[PDB]
Amino acid sequence: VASIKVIGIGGAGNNAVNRMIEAGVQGVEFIVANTDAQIISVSKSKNKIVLGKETSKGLGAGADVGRQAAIESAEEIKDALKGADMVFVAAGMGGGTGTGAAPIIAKLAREQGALTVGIITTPFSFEGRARNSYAIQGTEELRKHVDSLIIISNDRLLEVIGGVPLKDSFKEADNILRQGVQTITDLIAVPSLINLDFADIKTVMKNKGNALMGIGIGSGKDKAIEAANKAIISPLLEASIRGARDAIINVTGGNTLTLNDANDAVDIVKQAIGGEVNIIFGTAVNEHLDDEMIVTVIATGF
Amino acid sequence: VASIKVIGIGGAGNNAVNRMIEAGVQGVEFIVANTDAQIISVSKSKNKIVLGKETSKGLGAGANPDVGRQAAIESAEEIKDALKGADMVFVAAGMGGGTGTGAAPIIAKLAREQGALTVGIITTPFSFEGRARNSYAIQGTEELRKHVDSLIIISNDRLLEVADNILRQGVQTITDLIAVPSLINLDFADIKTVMKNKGNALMGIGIGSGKDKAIEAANKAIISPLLEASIRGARDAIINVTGGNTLTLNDANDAVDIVKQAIGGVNIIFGTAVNEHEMIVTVIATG
Numbered sequence A: 001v002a003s004i005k006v007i008g009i010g011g012a013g014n015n016a017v018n019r020m021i022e023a024g025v026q027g028v029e030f031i032v033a034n035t036d037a038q039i040i041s042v043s044k045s046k047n048k049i050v051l052g053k054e055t056s057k058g059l060g061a062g063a064d065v066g067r068q069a070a071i072e073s074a075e076e077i078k079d080a081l082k083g084a085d086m087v088f089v090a091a092g093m094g095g096g097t098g099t100g101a102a103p104i105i106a107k108l109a110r111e112q113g114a115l116t117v118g119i120i121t122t123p124f125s126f127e128g129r130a131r132n133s134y135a136i137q138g139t140e141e142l143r144k145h146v147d148s149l150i151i152i153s154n155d156r157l158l159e160v161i162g163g164v165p166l167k168d169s170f171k172e173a174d175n176i177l178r179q180g181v182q183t184i185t186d187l188i189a190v191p192s193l194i195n196l197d198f199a200d201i202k203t204v205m206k207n208k209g210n211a212l213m214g215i216g217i218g219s220g221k222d223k224a225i226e227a228a229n230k231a232i233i234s235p236l237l238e239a240s241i242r243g244a245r246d247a248i249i250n251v252t253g254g255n256t257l258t259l260n261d262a263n264d265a266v267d268i269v270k271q272a273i274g275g276e277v278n279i280i281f282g283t284a285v286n287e288h289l290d291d292e293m294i295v296t297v298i299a300t301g302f
Numbered sequence B: 001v002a003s004i005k006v007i008g009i010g011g012a013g014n015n016a017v018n019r020m021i022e023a024g025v026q027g028v029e030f031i032v033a034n035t036d037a038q039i040i041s042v043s044k045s046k047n048k049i050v051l052g053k054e055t056s057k058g059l060g061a062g063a064n065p066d067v068g069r070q071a072a073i074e075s076a077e078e079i080k081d082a083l084k085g086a087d088m089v090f091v092a093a094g095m096g097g098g099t100g101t102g103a104a105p106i107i108a109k110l111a112r113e114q115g116a117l118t119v120g121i122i123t124t125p126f127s128f129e130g131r132a133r134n135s136y137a138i139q140g141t142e143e144l145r146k147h148v149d150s151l152i153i154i155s156n157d158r159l160l161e162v163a164d165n166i167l168r169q170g171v172q173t174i175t176d177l178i179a180v181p182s183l184i185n186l187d188f189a190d191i192k193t194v195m196k197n198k199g200n201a202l203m204g205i206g207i208g209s210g211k212d213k214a215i216e217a218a219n220k221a222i223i224s225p226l227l228e229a230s231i232r233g234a235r236d237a238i239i240n241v242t243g244g245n246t247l248t249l250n251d252a253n254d255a256v257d258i259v260k261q262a263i264g265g266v267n268i269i270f271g272t273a274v275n276e277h278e279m280i281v282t283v284i285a286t287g
């Protein structure tokens, strides 16, 4: 029976430890260490460490504060890792705490006699250059003080979770944003059979707060029923559109879309919202849709 | 005719305006603002604002929304000039960084004070971008909500649909092989020889279901983007074949055989673990 300890440092490490405690990882003692006394307080770990409670005074670490707060806490760290055969040092590189504290904790863990494995992420490219270069410095220092260093790139992780190359990892998000704008602006500014007046958009959207958006696409004989219901319970909705006081409905279709289809989609959304909702709606033509229609609802008033 | 303007702020807002232009959104003037002049220089929009030109100097803001906020206050007059005359302004941004999070509420306020109907449309970050960025996004959402007429929020987490913690998987991949008994186990001294004084390691993951689950999972594992196309440059590797109660010795060895078949001698040690139904192969490569 080997003694295995995981010490999670900073935000990413604290996250990892909580997730291991919840998944019920067996036969491992967990430790959390963070300069931010707040994050520590609410942790699910039996073994808690506030780093450098002297200098930082527990008031976070920002983005040298990490290294110094680990040094100042060496005794609490040595005492929590004491007697381990293997120590995992878990951190996210790039931040204020994890970057500077991990190499110190690894050094202590290894000098005590533990087989010391660092496991770390490096930042997404969109986190910026300074953050990615701080991450590289911290990696090279951590490497000096571990037996082996498992390095997970958050860029490559995004490819795994999203299933697409990094270049395309936010295309779907970019596209929803495009749809959200276009849903409204086509009805105002692109002439079609049914446009909406700007004053009536204003009535739905002025001084409202949170506007819910659901998009749904459907095809075949029952496309209106499929499209409208998919928009009404879209995973993209913050909350239910039920009860909204005003809503905009954009019905988009190809050249074969019928008046009856558009009318059914509007009727479905009106019944789904219910009550005396004030509904306005318009249509848009998209000739690259083949026997499909898209229904978008923007609901306000809660 | 209504005058309609979209201003995209920060990296996400800038790529969103690019998508809107590519898709041929009509009737709308497009504007991009960023503290990072590099992203702006490759914008398809013909109206470009570098926020905080005098202080951040187009070099970017970093992680802190206060810098994005201060940059937008500095550029206030140039923002008003770009937006002047609009009846409706969309403010597009991704919450979580230093520029969108902090600049978007200021730009919203300027647009609304000019008289435009002002609509925010924003994304919130993935949960696995960590707590600093998700806390920032919460705060920036609330500040933007104060200054827009209407706020549409698109969650990246939920867009994922339409067991996530990579550090837990790396640790568990090794520990269950020695701390949890299963079909095949390893001794601490086996791990110690593969991992003592061995330097950089990388991790692979692969999933597979149904008939020939092994051939599928095992094959995905070794091509994993986490491995960065370098598994065969590893001298040693540990393999964790994890499955449901229906896991047999034949599956584990068919799995490990696939990997070994693309391995030299790559010294390979391996074991199993069990979960809720259906085959996951995790590779940790060292040396």
Ligand SMILES: Nc1nc2c(ncn2[C@@H]2O[C@H](COP(=O)(O)OP(=O)(O)O)[C@@H](O)[C@H]2O)c(=O)[nH]1
Residues within 6 Å of the ligand: A126, A170, A171, A173, A174, B009, B010, B011, B012, B013, B015, B016, B062, B093, B094, B095, B096, B097, B098, B099, B100, B101, B123, B124, B125, B126, B129, B133, B156
């Ligand atoms: N739609 C979209 N969202 C992105 C993109 N890149 C990153 N994001 C998301 O948007 C958030 C802000 O990133 P970004 O706009 O680049 O930050 P900033 O420029 O420093 O303010 C990130 O936390 C990601 O969730 C992108 O290209 N498109």
Ligand SMILES: Nc1nc2c(ncn2[C@@H]2O[C@H](COP(=O)(O)OP(=O)(O)O)[C@@H](O)[C@H]2O)c(=O)[nH]1
Residues within 6 Å of the ligand: A009, A010, A011, A012, A013, A015, A016, A061, A062, A063, A091, A092, A093, A094, A095, A096, A097, A098, A099, A121, A122, A123, A124, A127, A131, A154, A157, B127, B128, B129, B130, B131, B132, B166
């Ligand atoms: N994959 C993953 N990466 C994270 C997570 N949290 C943070 N990170 C990454 O780790 C870096 C450091 O963040 P964090 O640990 O919260 O900063 P610190 O506590 O101030 O050191 C971030 O810039 C992210 O790139 C997480 O839950 N999952």
